Coordinates of C-alpha atoms and ligand atoms in Angstrom, one line a residue:
X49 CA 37.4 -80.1 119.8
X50 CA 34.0 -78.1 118.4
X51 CA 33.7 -74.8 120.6
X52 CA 30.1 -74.7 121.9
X53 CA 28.5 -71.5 120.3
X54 CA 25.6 -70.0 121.9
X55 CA 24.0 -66.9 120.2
X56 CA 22.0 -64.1 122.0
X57 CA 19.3 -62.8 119.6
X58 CA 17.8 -59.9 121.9
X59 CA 17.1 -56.1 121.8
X60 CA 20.8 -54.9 122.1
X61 CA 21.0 -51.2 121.3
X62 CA 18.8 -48.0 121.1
X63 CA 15.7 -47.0 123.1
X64 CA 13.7 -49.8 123.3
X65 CA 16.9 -52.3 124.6
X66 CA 16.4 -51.6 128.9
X67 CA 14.9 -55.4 128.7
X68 CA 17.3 -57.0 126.1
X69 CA 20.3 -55.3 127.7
X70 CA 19.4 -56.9 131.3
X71 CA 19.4 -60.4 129.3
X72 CA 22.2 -59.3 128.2
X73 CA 24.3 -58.5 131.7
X74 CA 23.1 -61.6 132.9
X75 CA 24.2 -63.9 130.1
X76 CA 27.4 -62.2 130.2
X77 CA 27.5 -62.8 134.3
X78 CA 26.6 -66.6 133.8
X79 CA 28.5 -68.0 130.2
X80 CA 31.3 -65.9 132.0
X81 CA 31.4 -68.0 135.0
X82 CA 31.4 -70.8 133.1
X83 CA 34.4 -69.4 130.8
X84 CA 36.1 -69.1 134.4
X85 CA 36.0 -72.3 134.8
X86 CA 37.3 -73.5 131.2
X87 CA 34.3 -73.2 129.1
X88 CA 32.7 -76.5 127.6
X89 CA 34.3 -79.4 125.4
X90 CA 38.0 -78.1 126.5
X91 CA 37.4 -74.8 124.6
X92 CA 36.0 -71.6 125.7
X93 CA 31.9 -70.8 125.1
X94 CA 31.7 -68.5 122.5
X95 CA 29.0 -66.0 122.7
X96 CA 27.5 -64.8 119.5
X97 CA 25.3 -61.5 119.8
X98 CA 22.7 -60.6 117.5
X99 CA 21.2 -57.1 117.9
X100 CA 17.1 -57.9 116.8
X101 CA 16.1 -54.6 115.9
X102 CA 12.9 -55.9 114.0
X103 CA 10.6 -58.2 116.5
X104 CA 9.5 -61.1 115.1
X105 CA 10.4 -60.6 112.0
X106 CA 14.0 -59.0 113.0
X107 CA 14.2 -62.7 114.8
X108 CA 13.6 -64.7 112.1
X109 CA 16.2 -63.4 109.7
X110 CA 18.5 -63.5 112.8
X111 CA 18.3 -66.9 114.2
X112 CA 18.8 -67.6 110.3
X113 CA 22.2 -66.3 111.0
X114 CA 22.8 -67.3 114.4
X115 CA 22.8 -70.9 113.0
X116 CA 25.1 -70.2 109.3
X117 CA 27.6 -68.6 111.9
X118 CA 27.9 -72.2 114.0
X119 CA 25.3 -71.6 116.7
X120 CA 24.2 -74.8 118.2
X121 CA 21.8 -73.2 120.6
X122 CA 19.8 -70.1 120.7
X123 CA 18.9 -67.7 124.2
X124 CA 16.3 -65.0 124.0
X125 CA 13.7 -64.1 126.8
X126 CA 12.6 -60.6 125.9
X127 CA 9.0 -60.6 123.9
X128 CA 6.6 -63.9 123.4
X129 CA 6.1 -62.4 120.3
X130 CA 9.6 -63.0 119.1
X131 CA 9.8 -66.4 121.2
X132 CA 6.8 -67.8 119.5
X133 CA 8.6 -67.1 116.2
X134 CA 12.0 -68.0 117.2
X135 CA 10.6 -71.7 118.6
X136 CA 8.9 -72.2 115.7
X137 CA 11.7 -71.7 113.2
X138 CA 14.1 -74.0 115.8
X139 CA 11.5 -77.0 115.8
X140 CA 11.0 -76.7 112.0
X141 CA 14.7 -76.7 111.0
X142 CA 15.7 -79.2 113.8
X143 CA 12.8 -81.5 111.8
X144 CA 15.1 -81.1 108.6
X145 CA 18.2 -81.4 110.0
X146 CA 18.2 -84.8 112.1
X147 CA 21.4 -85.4 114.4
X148 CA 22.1 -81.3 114.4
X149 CA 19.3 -80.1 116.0
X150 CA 19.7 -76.7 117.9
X151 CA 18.7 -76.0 121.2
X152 CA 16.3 -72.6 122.3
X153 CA 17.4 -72.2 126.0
X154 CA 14.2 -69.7 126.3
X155 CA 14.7 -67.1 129.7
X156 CA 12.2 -65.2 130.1
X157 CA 9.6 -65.4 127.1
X158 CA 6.5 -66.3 129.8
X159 CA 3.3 -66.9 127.5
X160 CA 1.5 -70.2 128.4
X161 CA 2.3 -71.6 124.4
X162 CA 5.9 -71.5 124.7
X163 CA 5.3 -75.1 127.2
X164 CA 1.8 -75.8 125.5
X165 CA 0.4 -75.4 122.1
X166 CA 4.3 -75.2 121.2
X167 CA 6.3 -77.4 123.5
X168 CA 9.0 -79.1 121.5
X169 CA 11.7 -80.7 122.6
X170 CA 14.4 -78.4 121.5
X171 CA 12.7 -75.4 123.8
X172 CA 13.1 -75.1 127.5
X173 CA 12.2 -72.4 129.2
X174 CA 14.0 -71.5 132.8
X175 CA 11.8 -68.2 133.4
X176 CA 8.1 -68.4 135.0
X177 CA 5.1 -68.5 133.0
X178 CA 1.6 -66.3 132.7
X179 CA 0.2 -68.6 135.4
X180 CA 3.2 -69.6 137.7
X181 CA 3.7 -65.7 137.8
X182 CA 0.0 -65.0 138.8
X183 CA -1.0 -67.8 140.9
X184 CA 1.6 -66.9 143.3
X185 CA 1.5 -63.2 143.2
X186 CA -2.4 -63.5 144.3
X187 CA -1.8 -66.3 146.7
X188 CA 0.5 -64.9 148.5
X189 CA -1.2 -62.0 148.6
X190 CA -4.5 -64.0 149.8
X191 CA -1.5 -65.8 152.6
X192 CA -0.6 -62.1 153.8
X193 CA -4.4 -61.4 154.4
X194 CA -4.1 -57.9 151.8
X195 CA -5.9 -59.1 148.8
X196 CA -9.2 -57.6 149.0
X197 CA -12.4 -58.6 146.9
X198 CA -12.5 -56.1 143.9
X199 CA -9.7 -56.7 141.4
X200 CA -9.0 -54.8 138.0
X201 CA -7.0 -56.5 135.1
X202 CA -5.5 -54.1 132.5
X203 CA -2.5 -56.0 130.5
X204 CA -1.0 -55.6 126.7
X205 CA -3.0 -56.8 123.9
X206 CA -0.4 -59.7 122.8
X207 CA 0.1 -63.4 123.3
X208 CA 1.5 -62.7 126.5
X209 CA -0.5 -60.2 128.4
X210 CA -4.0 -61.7 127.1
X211 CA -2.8 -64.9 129.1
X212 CA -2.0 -62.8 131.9
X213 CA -5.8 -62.2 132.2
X214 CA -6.9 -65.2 131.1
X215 CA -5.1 -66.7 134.0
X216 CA -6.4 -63.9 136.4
X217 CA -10.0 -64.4 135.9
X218 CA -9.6 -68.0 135.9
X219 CA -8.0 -68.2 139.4
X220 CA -10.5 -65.2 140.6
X221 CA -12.9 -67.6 142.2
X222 CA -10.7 -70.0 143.9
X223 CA -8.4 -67.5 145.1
X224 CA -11.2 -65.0 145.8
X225 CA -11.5 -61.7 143.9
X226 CA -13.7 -60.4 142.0
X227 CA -12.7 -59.3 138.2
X228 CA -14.6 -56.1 138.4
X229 CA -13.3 -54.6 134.9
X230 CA -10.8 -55.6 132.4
X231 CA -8.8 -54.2 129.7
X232 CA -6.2 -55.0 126.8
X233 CA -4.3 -52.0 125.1
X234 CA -1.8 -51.7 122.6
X235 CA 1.2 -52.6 123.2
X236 CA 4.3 -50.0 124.1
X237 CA 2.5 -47.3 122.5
X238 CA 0.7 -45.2 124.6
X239 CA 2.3 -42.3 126.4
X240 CA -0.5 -40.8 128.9
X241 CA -2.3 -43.8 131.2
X242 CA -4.6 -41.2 132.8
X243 CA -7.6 -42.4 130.9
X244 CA -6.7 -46.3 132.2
X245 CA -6.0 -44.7 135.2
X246 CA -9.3 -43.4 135.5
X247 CA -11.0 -46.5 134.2
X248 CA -9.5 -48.3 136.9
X249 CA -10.6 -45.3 139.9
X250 CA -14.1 -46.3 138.2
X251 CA -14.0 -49.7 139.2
X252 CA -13.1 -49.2 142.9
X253 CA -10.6 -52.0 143.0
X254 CA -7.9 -53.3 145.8
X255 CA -5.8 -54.7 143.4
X256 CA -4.7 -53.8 140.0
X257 CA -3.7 -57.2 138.3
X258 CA -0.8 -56.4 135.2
X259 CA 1.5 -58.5 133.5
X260 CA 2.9 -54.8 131.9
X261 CA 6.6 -54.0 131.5
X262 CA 8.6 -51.2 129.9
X263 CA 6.9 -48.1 129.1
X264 CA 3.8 -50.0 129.8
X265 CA 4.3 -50.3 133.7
X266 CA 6.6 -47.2 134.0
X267 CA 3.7 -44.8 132.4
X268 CA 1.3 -46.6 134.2
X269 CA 2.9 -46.3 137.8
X270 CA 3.5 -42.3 136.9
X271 CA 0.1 -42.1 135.8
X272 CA -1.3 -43.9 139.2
X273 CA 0.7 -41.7 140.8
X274 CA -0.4 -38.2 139.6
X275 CA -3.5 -39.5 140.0
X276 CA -3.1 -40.5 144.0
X277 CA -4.5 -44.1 143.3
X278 CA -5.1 -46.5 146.0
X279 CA -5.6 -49.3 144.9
X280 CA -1.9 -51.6 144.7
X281 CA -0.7 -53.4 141.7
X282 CA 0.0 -57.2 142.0
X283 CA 2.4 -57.5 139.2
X284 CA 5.0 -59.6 137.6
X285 CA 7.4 -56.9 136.4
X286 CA 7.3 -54.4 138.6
X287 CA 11.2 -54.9 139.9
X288 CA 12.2 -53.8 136.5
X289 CA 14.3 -50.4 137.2
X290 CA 12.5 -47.2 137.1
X291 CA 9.4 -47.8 138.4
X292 CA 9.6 -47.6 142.0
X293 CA 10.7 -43.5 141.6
X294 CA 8.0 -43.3 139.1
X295 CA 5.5 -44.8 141.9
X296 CA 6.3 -41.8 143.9
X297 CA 4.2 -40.9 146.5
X298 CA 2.4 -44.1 146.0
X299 CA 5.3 -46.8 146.2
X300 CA 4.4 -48.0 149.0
X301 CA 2.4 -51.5 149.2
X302 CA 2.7 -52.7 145.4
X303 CA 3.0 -56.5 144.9
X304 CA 5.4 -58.6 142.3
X305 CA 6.2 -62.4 142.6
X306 CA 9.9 -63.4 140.8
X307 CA 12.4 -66.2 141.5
X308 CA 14.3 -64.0 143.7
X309 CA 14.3 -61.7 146.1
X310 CA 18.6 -60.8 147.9
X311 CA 17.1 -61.1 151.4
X312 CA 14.4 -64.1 150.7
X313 CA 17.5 -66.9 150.9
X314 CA 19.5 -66.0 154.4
X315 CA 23.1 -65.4 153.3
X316 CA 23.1 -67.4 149.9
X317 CA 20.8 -65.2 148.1
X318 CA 22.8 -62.2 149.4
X319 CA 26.0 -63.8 148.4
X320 CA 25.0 -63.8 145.1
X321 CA 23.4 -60.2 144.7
X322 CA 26.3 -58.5 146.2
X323 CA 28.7 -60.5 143.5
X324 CA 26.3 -59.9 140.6
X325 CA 26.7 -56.1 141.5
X326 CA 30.1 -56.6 141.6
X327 CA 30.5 -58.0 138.1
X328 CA 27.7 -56.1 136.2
X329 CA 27.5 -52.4 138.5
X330 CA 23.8 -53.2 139.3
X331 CA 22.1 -55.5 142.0
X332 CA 19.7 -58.1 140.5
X333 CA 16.2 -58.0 139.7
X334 CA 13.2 -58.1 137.1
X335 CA 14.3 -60.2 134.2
X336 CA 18.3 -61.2 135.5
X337 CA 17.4 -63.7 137.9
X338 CA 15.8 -66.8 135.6
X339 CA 18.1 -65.7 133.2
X340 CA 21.3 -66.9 135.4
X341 CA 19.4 -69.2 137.3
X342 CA 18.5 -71.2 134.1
X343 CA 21.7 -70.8 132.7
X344 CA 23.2 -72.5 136.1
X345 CA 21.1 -75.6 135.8
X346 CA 22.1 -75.6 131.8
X347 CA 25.7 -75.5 133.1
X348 CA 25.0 -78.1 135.5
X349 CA 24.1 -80.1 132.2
X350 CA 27.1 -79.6 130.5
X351 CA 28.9 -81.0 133.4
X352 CA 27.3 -83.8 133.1
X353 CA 27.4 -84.6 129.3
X354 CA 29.3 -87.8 128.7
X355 CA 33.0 -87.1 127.2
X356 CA 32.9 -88.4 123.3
X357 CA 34.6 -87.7 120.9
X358 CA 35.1 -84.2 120.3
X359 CA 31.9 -83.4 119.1
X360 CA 29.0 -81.5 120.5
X361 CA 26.0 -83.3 120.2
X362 CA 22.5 -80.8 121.4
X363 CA 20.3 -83.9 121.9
X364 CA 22.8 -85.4 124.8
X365 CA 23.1 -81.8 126.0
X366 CA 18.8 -81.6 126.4
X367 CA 18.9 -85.2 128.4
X368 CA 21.1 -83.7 130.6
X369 CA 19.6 -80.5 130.9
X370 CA 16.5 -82.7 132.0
X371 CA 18.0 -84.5 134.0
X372 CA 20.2 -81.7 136.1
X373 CA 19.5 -80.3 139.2
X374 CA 21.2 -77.2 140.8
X375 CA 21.5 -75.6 143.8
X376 CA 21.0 -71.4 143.3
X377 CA 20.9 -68.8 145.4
X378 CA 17.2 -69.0 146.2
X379 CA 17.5 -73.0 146.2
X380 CA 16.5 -76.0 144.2
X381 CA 16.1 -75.2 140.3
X382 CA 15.1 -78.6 138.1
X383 CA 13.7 -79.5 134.4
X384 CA 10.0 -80.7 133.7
X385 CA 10.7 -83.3 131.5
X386 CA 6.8 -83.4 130.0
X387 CA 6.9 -79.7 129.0
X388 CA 10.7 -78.4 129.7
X389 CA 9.0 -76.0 132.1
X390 CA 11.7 -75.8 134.6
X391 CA 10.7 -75.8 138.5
X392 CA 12.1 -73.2 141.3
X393 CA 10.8 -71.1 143.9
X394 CA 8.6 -67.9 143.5
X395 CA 9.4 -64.8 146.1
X396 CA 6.2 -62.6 146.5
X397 CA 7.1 -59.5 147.3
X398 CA 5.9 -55.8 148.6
X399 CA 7.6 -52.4 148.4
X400 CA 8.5 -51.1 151.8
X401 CA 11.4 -48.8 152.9
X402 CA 12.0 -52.2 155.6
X403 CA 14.0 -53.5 151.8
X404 CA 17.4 -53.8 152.7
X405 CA 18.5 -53.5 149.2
X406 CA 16.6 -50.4 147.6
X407 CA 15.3 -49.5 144.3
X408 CA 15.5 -46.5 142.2
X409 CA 17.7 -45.0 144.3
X410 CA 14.2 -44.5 146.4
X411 CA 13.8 -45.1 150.2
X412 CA 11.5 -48.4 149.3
X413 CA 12.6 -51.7 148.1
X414 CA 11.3 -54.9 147.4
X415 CA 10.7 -57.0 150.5
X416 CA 9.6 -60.5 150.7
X417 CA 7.1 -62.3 152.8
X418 CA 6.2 -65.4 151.0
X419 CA 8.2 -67.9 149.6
X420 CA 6.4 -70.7 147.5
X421 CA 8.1 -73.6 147.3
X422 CA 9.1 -75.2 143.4
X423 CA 6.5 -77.6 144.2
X424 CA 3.9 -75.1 144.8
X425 CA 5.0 -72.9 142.5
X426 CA 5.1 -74.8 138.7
X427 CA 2.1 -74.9 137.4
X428 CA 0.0 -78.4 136.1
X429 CA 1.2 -79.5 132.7
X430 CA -0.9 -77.6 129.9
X431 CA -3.6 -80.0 128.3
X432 CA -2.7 -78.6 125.0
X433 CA 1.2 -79.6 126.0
X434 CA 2.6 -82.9 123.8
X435 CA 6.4 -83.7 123.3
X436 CA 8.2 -85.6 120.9
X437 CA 10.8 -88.0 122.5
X438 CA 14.1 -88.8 121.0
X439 CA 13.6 -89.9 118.2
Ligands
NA292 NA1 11.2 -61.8 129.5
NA293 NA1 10.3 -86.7 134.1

């Protein structure tokens, strides 16, 4: 029998790996419960790590690799920037190589493109997007009655952050705020936010709209907070650890929407953080969630991939994926099978020392208070999105 081999081409080591490694403990978690159970094709999955030290370009020459080594399928979810370059090179060798095509199980790469412009039928991403993120995180804040009128965008000048506020002042007058000011910076550079800080104070906002993560939210919340700023962030990221003690003073009242929340699912979605402590020494947020969630409805796939012959065939495996349905911890997870955007719940969330689990080690945690539904949550198929059917 052909062992399935899934490579993880992510940030793995050194200071700029907080987001890779997190992708990391959760693929681990996941592809090591389904090793528990006996793996796929009567052999155990093997996973395949390569360390991408070089962005895009670091990608390129390592999916190269990935796929000279056996890899059948592909997982990354840490930068756009490397996603839009590692789907790319997938959909152009899977056009030269007919019958072994290789899958990009995408979990956590959220620029619109990735389902639009560049929706192939070898990508599916598990993870939300720029406007499944931001759609909910303002709604729900509009449901709770604490989104006020004045809103700021400041986000990182790349692929993924320019949809972030392309999708904010698009919603702004449905939803109801006004974009007061806007800004793009460079990205994972800058080490003092004061002067954004203050550009922001200018603009006498209620909410702070940011798609920012790493250094770009954690400098950001430290500068807010030296700064006593009042205004809340409505984020997408914030949940990452370190930036609840960096808040401070301020933590109190800051916004993020994710797939999960350990208290937003009665029992099941406490189950499952109190086990994914257990195996990884950390309770689960920011980027971990998607990534095990997707990688339980993929599982659910493999389950239900005929039995042939021995053989691993990666177009069977993306029917099924399209086809599968799961039940997670925060409920049902499915496959778009126009865009392979996949559909769950969103969980928007405030920071309040009423968390039962808490962050940073702080007496705040996340807390939800709206739940949005799968089918409220996935956004309309992209214009720009066209698929190629088998084949
Ligand atoms: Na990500
Ligand atoms: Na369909």
């Amino acid at each position: 029998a052909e062992p399935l081999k899934i490579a993880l081409v992510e940030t793995l080591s050194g200071p700029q790996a907080s987001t890779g490694l997190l992708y990391r403990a959760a693929v681990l978690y996941q592809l090591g419960k389904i090793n528990e159970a006996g793996g796929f094709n009567g052999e155990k999955i093997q996973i395949l790590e390569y360390d991408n030290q070089g962005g895009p370009v670091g990608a390129a020459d390592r999916v190269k690799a990935a796929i000279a080594d056996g890899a059948q399928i592909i997982v990354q979810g840490s930068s756009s920037a490397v996603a839009g370059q590692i789907t790319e090179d997938v959909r152009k060798y899977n056009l030269r190589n007919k019958g072994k095509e290789v899958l990009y199980l995408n979990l956590g790469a959220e620029a619109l493109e990735l389902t639009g412009s560049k929706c192939h039928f070898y990508h599916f991403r598990f993870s939300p997007n720029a406007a499944i993120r931001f759609k909910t995180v303002a709604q729900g804040m509009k449901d709770k009655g604490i989104l006020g009128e004045r809103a700021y965008s400041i986000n990182q000048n790349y692929s993924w952050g320019v949809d972030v506020e392309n999708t904010v002042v698009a919603n702004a007058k449905e939803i109801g705020y006004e974009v007061v000011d806007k800004t793009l910076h460079e990205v994972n550079k800058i080490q003092d936010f004061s002067p954004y800080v203050a550009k922001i104070q200018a603009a006498n906002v209620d909410t702070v709209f940011t798609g920012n993560w790493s250094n770009d939210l954690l400098l950001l919340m430290k500068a807010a907070s030296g700064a006593g700023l009042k205004a809340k962030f409505a984020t997408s990221f914030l949940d990452q650890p370190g930036n609840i003690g960096n808040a401070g003073a301020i933590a109190e009242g800051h916004i993020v929407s994710t797939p999960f929340n350990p208290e937003a699912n009665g029992e099941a979605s406490m189950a499952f953080a109190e086990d994914y402590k257990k195996v990884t020494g950390h309770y689960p947020s920011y980027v971990e969630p998607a990534a095990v969630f997707g990688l339980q409805l993929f599982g659910e796939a493999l389950k239900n991939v005929k039995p042939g012959e021995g053989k691993i065939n990666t177009t069977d495996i993306a029917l099924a994926i399209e086809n599968a349905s799961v039940k997670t911890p925060m409920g049902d997870y499915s496959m778009r099978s126009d865009d392979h955007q996949a559909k769950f719940p969103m969980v928007v969330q405030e920071v309040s020392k009423k968390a039962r689990i808490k962050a940073d080690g702080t007496e705040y945690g996340f807390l939800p208070f709206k739940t949005f539904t799968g089918d409220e949550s996935i956004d309309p198929v992209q214009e720009s999105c066209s698929m190629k059917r088998p084949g």
